[PDB]
């Protein structure tokens, strides 16, 4: 896969998206009845989630356009969330069809203090799809190369350039050539590929 | 206007040493009270007793960096002080800036504010659309510069007050040879005044690579 346009993207988005980057707002309401809400645009989302806790609520309103960019799914998003805390935090969510994406949840001695520390632990210590690797652009480069017929010829190939640096990890990713990867951070290169390769850099 | 763009030492300290334009002058140090008073007696309800909600969009006023109360409708407080300076009853050296876009009133007596002089425009023409100064004042030049100011025909604009005015270049205007040329409150005495002693002797400084000048 060289001039595989879509293959480029397919790797881009596989190299750090956090809950914090898809959440338009978060609120913590008081709903003591675990079988209906004090909220309108939520009703449906309860009843349609009982077939095939603490009275303190925490709602998140995720962005639509933001779920198409980094591409995400309520099923996934939550799936992640749920398995992050696990058996001591029941969570629910609407379905991608709706006109308002949401995620409700409760815990399981002063709860308004706890359900707020778990406000952050949700927006800054939880990843969805690595680290230190922000912006990641794509480019069409000039790569001279051996035609079968001998002569060297123009065969541009897509390449992903980053805006941060981690190697040991972004190296073992399915779809790259851990024989050509390269960070200008020589410091790193030496640590990963052996002083020699370091010198080369 | 205040400093010459060209004259300044090469290497070492470069830009840490500035020279004054021809027209620039520095403030000296007037007194505050004859204006603090002159105020809290023309609409300035003192800070001491303030109420944020009864007085919503209350334009707050500052004096030399102190907050001496707010004022209700200021539009006039403004075009009164400005009429006071032009007759010469609040030193032409003081600075008064009205920042509508924030609702505040700047008062400066300070000593060390560089200022330049400009012609006043004022749409004061019940005969058209104009520089308060006329070709009668000119040819009239017992008529010093002290009078050109005591008649509200020219004003001393410091850098701060500058922010809220609109200056016209060529008084007049505002051939396949000359250089192509592209609300006013003041006009420029003359653009060739933004220069200081140094460049003033340079012929056609407007034709050389700036770094050479």
């Amino acid at each position: 896969i060289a001039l595989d346009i879509e293959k480029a993207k397919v790797i881009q988005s596989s190299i750090y998206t956090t809950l914090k980057n898809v959440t338009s707002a978060t609120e913590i309401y008081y709903d003591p009845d675990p079988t209906s809400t004090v909220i309108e645009e939520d009703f449906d989302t309860v009843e349609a989630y009982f077939s095939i806790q603490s009275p303190w609520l925490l709602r998140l309103e995720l962005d639509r356009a933001r779920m198409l960019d980094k591409q995400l799914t309520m099923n996934q998003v939550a799936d992640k969330i749920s398995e992050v805390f696990s058996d001591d935090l029941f969570v629910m969510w609407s379905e991608d069809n709706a006109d308002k994406l949401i995620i409700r949840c409760r815990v399981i001695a002063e709860e308004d203090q706890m359900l707020k520390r778990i406000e952050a632990h949700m927006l800054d210590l939880i990843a969805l799809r690595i680290p230190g690797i922000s912006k990641v652009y794509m480019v069409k480069h000039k790569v001279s190369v051996p035609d079968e017929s001998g002569e060297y010829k123009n065969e541009e190939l897509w390449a992903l350039e980053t805006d941060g640096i981690n190697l040991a990890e972004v190296m073992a990713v399915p779809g790259v050539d851990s024989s050509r990867t390269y960070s200008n951070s020589f410091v790193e290169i030496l640590s990963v590929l052996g002083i020699e390769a370091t010198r080369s850099s | 206007g205040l400093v010459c763009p060209a004259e300044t030492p090469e290497g070492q300290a470069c830009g840490l040493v500035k020279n004054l334009s021809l027209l620039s002058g520095i403030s000296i140090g007037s007194p505050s009270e004859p204006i603090i008073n002159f105020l809290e007696e023309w609409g300035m309800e003192p800070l001491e007793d303030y109420d944020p909600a009864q007085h919503t969009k209350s334009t707050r006023i500052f004096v030399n960096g102190v907050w001496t109360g707010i004022h209700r409708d200021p539009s006039m407080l403004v075009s009164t002080m400005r009429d006071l300076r032009r007759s010469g009853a609040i030193s032409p050296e003081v600075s008064i800036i009205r920042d509508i876009r924030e609702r505040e009133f700047k008062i400066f007596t300070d000593v060390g504010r560089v200022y330049r002089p400009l012609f006043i425009v004022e749409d004061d023409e019940s005969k058209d659309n104009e520089l308060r100064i006329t070709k009668e004042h000119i040819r009239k030049i017992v008529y010093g510069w002290s009078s050109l100011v005591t008649s509200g025909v020219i004003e001393y604009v410091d850098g701060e007050e500058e922010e809220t005015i609109m200056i016209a270049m060529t008084p007049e205007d505002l051939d396949t040879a000359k250089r192509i040329k592209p609300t006013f409150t003041h006009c420029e005495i003359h653009p060739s005044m933004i220069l200081g002693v140094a460049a003033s002797i340079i012929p056609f400084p407007d034709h050389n690579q700036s770094p050479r000048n």
Partner: protein, 214 residues
Amino acid sequence: MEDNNRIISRLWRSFRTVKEMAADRGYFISQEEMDQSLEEFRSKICDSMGNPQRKLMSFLANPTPEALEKYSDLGTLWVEFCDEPSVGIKTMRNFCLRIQEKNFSTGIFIYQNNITPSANKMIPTVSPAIIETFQESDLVVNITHHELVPKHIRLSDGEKSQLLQRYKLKESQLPRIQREDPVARYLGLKRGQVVKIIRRSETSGRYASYRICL
């Protein structure tokens, strides 16, 4: 398929790498034994549903017909893997002992996430033999394979005691290489061993450098 389909694809590349290192170290191994496709691999070290059981991957290998020619006493190596994603000081004695008796000389445990501080503090406790530790997530891609990584090579205490005479060197005057150097580990060096590096050069074609391991 979920996201466990990949935790296999990797354990496999990490594998082949081990092999390569073992043959490059100076042992026997067929190019095929390295080229075991992902397919014909699954059904060989898996149980029921589709999970790989490592306790059955570990193996041995030995000094090639050649290796015995430059390096006499180069003993036999043993590579081991473990299903305990956090192996500790206890499941350790099973390794520390397994060789101190079979009498090999080269231990190679592949800890998945991490070994215990109580554990590894029992490595240099069985000489002459020596033991190494390699994290899993660090052997997924053979580092030697990299573009910038030039070919290195060991040197008998003969080929070494030669370089020195041939260049009139006092050992210290020779370019060095770190013990914890990625490549140094890969070929399993030791404090006192030399390494000839041979890389391409836009000036002569090939230059021959040497690094002793401090």
